[PDB]
Design an enzyme around this catalytic site. Structure first.
Site, short mmCIF file in Angstrom:
data_model
loop_
_atom_site.label_atom_id
_atom_site.label_comp_id
_atom_site.label_asym_id
_atom_site.label_seq_id
_atom_site.Cartn_x
_atom_site.Cartn_y
_atom_site.Cartn_z
CG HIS A 1 -6.20 4.49 -4.55
ND1 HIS A 1 -5.03 4.29 -4.92
CD2 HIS A 1 -6.58 3.32 -4.08
CE1 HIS A 1 -4.52 3.06 -4.86
NE2 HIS A 1 -5.47 2.43 -4.23
CG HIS B 1 -2.19 -1.22 0.82
ND1 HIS B 1 -2.27 -2.16 1.20
CD2 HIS B 1 -3.07 -0.83 0.10
CE1 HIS B 1 -3.45 -2.83 0.79
NE2 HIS B 1 -4.01 -1.82 -0.05
MG LIG Z 1 -7.15 1.14 -0.31
ZN LIG Z 2 -5.09 0.79 -3.39
#
Ligand SMILES: [Mg+2]
Ligand SMILES: [Zn+2]
Ligand SMILES: CNC(=O)c1ccncc1NC(=O)c1nc(C2CC2)ccc1Nc1cncnc1
Length: 313
Positions: A106, A68
């Protein structure tokens, strides 16, 4: 103003394909992203002095987590860029500007834990946002960076163009809450079977962009097998860390996250491509035909995991 970015021939060609990898060189990712904006949206729609500063603040506010991370941000922007460029007419000049920014931001300030882990931990962010916790955090970080001085990339929009574009980004970022994906796909399916789907219905576009966003967010599964295989490691590094943190809270975690249940991963991948990825790209291709390469590449990888189980790798 006459200052277009170029790329090495191989990158210039390979970047237009859905299955493009952005490579191990951190320091080109910003150039790649700018390049995507300039072809996807024009040389004009963002002032370079301001874009570059926005990009570098956004890089800084992603963390050093296995999956991430900043590289995930840009992969997801790339995939959105490929969808826009193969669906050239279907989307307004504003949608193009907001969706690449949406994708870049995001996952802002992600710590490598699920919404569930915050809830079981009683993290403040779960108090302040009951559903789509990280996702409202990410949109919140995005608006914060947009309010830093010399960072409003949107300065040249009218008040109402501004409110439209921030509203696009917010719904877009919220749609990456996979909990919401399932019903968003169900409803889009039913509207395409029963033929009610209409891309001038703004509630319909919303859902469609929501699916595009799920598709881009998951696009590590639409890469060539060697990329998918090695990204799978990153996603599991986070899962197993969370599982460890679940156990600390005295909670046996779901097996997807139990690092003692490493054996069960290939079956788990099968389950996932069947339950999630295949459905996502199937319905996306149903709606936007030029995105099929995503479904084909997804299927190949599903097959690659069938071969894993069968002992053939
Ligand atoms: Mg996410
Ligand atoms: Zn993502
Ligand atoms: C919702 N169900 C499940 O999340 C699931 C269940 C059983 N096993 C695995 C599962 N999830 C994933 O594998 C996975 N999940 C996600 C988001 C957190 C939800 C994103 C990418 C994934 N895969 C991936 C990515 N990039 C390269 N290779 C693989």
């Amino acid at each position: 103003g006459l200052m277009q970015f170029t790329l090495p021939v191989r990158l210039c060609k390979e970047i237009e394909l859905f299955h493009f990898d952005i490579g191990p060189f951190e320091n080109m990712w910003p150039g790649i992203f700018v390049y995507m904006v300039h072809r996807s949206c024009g040389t004009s729609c963002f002032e370079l002095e301001k874009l570059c500063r926005f990009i570098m603040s956004v890089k800084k506010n992603y963390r050093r987590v296995p999956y991430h991370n900043w590289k995930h941000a840009v992969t997801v922007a790339h995939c959105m860029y490929a969808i826009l460029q193969n669906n050239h007419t279907l989307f307004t000049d504003l949608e193009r500007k907001g969706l690449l920014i949406a994708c870049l931001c995001h996952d802002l300030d992600h710590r490598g834990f699920s919404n569930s882990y915050l809830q079981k931990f009683d993290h403040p962010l779960a108090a302040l946002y009951s559903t789509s916790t990280m996702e409202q955090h990410h949109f919140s970080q995005t608006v914060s960076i947009l309010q830093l001085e010399g960072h409003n990339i949107f300065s040249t929009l009218s008040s109402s163009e501004y409110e439209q574009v921030l509203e696009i980004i917010r719904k877009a970022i919220i749609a990456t809450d996979l909990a919401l994906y399932f019903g968003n796909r169900k409803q889009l399916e039913e509207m395409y079977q029963t033929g009610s789907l209409n891309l001038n219905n703004q509630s319909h576009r919303d859902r469609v962009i929501g699916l595009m966003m799920t598709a881009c967010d998951l696009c590590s599964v639409t890469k060539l097998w060697p990329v998918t295989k090695l990204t799978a490691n990153d996603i599991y590094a986070e899962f197993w860390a969370e599982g460890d943190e679940m156990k600390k809270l005295g909670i046996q975690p779901i097996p997807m996250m139990d690092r003692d249940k490493k054996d069960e991963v290939p079956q788990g991948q099968l389950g996932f491509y069947n339950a999630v990825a295949i459905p996502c790209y199937t319905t996306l291709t149903q709606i936007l035909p030029p995105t099929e390469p995503l479904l084909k590449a997804c299927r190949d990888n599903l097959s690659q995991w069938e071969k894993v189980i069968r002992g053939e790798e």
